[PDB]
Amino acid sequence: LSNERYQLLSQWPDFTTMYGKDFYYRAHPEDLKKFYDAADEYYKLYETVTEFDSLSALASQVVPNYAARRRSTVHPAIGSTVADGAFTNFLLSKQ
């Protein structure tokens, strides 16, 4: 999934082609501060999508709730559809 986010950070337009002083002084001061904020934001997003040592601790938050859902009093592989079919077999047979 981080690969699919990094693929759309690979499609980001190059803002370091507009770092010269030709684009500094032709441009509105507020739009230039916005452009520099947009470059700072891309550096934040790219520093945090390539922190791959954090995925191994992100995966430990999906693990306990899933393992407690499998630690069932009926069956590890039970679900709603099998329980519904067994409820018809229990209900539509006699008593």
Place this chain on the structure above:
Amino acid sequence: KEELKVIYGDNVDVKHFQASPRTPVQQLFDSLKNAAANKERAAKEAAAAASPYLAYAVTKKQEVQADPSNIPFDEVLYPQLSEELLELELSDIREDEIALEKA
């Protein structure tokens, strides 16, 4: 002072370079007198990098930085901006001279 203290020492004498800035020839001959120490620092740092990637990155940064043709001169890059920055101070001096000729 922060731009020059890596070359001229800690007693950098910043007034001399504020009054008379360095010519591009002196920028060359101050990039050439630390280039041996810069290449030895880059080799000692590329040897002690935690990755072949980071080692290639530091030797490439020193390869593109120690070349004295890669000093960015604003007077060569933007001529019109540099002459306007000259006229920004020539106009203040012209306003003082207009006041003194009115007096």
Place this chain on the structure above:
Amino acid sequence: KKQATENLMKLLQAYKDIGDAKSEPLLKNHNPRTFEDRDYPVPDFRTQNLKAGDVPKFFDTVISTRASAAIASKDKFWAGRKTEAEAASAKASAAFPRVAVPEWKKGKTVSIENLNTVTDKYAAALVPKRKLALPVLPEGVKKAVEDFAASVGQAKNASEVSELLAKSLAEKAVVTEGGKVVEGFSYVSKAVAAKVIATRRAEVHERLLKLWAKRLLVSPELAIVPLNEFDAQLASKFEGISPKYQELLSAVAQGNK
């Protein structure tokens, strides 16, 4: 966020090519002096009924009001330029290069011969778009002239001969845009510009010294009224000038006896 960045880059390109369609100077519109009205009717302080200490506050009010009007004229200019480039950032090309990041496919891994080439694309943006070809002297040429200076027995000034050759090449360092030489490109350096500023500044300062030399040769009593406390003495009418320095200026004016 990517669309906002692309819109901002189309906006900066719109700003540049409608600042170059008018061909205007770069620092003309960021300088609020150029929006300053020099020909305003310049209010007379003598027709405003000031007391003694009230004249420099009047001058400060006039100067700050005119400066605020210049800044607001600059802001109205940039609001007009902002709408003029918002109208041209819409109908644009938007073919920008993309940020060079290393190739990482979904199941695969990155290779160092792709990380290295995106590092090369990063360090290729550290060269300037137009640079001086400052000729560094190689060891193979400084030694090919150093042994030549050692052949005629001038080997102790051979380093001097080498550095004089290096400097003589460095003074006529020609510019280089993209490998090719822009012929006839003239630039004025930063040391030359600061020397021009220093000479013009010294000639205007000696005009100041000449002005006060005349005013203190004719009437040398003026030295007792300090320059910061001069228009603190003024008023609108002459009889309202504060008498702090008036009696002393009258008594110093009669001479040393």
